Amino acid sequence: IRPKVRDQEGRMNYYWTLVEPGDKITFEATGNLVVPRYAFAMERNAGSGIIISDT
Amino acid sequence: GLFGAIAGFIEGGWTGMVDGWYGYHHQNEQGSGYAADLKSTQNAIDGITNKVNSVIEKMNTQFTAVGKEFNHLEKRIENLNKKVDDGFLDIWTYNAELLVLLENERTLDYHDSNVKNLYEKVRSQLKNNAKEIGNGCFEFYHKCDNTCMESVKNGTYDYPKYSEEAKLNREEI
């Protein structure tokens, strides 16, 4: 019942991973899980970075 | 200056000289005009070229990135990253400003020496056949036509040719 933000005492910790081409993602749970709906097939390029600017 | 030629006995420069850095001005019966010294100008241009290249050639472009941000647990390393970036920033800024300030004075003194050696080469060539009137000028005690003028500039000047012609005018006064 930790201090609620946005009028929700419940929380949701978000995790991520990159499944390699030719691999399984065994999603096993008994409850309290939020499953993915849309995935993202991608090919990274370099480091680059994130520009935090309003320009 | 360091050699006392620029802003020294030669107080000002020539705006009409647009072909080189150092040169001569002649005034004979045929006419007058400006003419830059080829040997001093071309060597000076290459020397300053090498000086500039000696500074910027090794300063090559670098691939940069924003990098991973630091989480709450990554506080100590984040401070270390701030320490190293600031340390390199302070060193590079100090060295770049200091080098430019030191090399600029040496560059200015380099022109001073080049002008001075040009004056000495003419002064040693003419010897007694001319009068040092100051401001880098030489009033000839003899008759100097265009061929005589270029002979001094090319370095192929002959003192004995006008030795007696000048000596009569020297002993005149």
The backbone torsions φ and ψ at residue B26, rounded to the nearest 5 degrees and listed phi first, read -110, 155
The helix or strand, by DSSP H or E, that contains position B133, with its residue range, turns out to be strand B130-134
Give chain A's largest Cα–Cα span.
Answer: 47
Cβ neighbours of residue A11 closer than 8 Å, sequence gap 6 or more: A2
Taking the C-alpha atoms of residue B122 and residue B153, their distance in angstroms, rounded to an integer, is 8
Resolution (A): 3.2
Residue of B66, B67, B69 lying closest to A51 (CB–CB):
B66
**Parallel, antiparallel or unpaired: strands B32-36 and B130-134:** unpaired
Nearest to B129 by CA among B138, B118, B119, B116: B138
Tokens of B58: 């090794």
B residues 21-80 near A, CB within 8 Å? 65-67, 69
The backbone torsions φ and ψ at residue B97, rounded to the nearest 5 degrees and listed phi first, read -65, -45
Tokens of A47: 């480091």
- 3-state SS class at B172: helix
- Helix and strand numbers, DSSP H then E, in chain B: 4, 4
The structure's method of determination equals X-ray
Q: Is A47 on the interface with B (CB under 8 A)?
A: yes
Q: Is A51 on the interface with B (CB under 8 A)?
A: yes
Taking the C-alpha atoms of residue B116 and residue B120, their distance in angstroms, rounded to an integer, is 6
The string over B145-157, giving b where at least 16 C-beta atoms fall within 10 Å of a residue's C-beta and e elsewhere, is eeebbebbbeeeb
Q: Is A22 on the interface with B (CB under 8 A)?
A: no
Cβ neighbours of residue B163 closer than 8 Å, sequence gap 6 or more: B128, B129
* Sign of CA pseudo-dihedral B120, B121, B122, B123: positive
Q: Is A49 on the interface with B (CB under 8 A)?
A: yes
CB contact under 8 A, B67 and A48: no
Taking the C-alpha atoms of residue A26 and residue A52, their distance in angstroms, rounded to an integer, is 36
Q: Is A48 on the interface with B (CB under 8 A)?
A: yes
Cβ–Cβ < 8 Å for B44, B35: no
CB contact under 8 A, B65 and A49: yes
Taking the C-alpha atoms of residue B5 and residue B113, their distance in angstroms, rounded to an integer, is 8
Cβ neighbours of residue B33 closer than 8 Å, sequence gap 6 or more: B25, B26
Taking the C-alpha atoms of residue B34 and residue B79, their distance in angstroms, rounded to an integer, is 64
B126, exposed or middle or buried, with CB in 10 Å at 0-12, 13-18, 19+? buried
| Set of chain B residues whose Cβ sits within 8 Å of the Cβ of A48 | 65-66
Distances (CA, A) of B68 to A19, A45, A51, B75: 21, 15, 12, 13
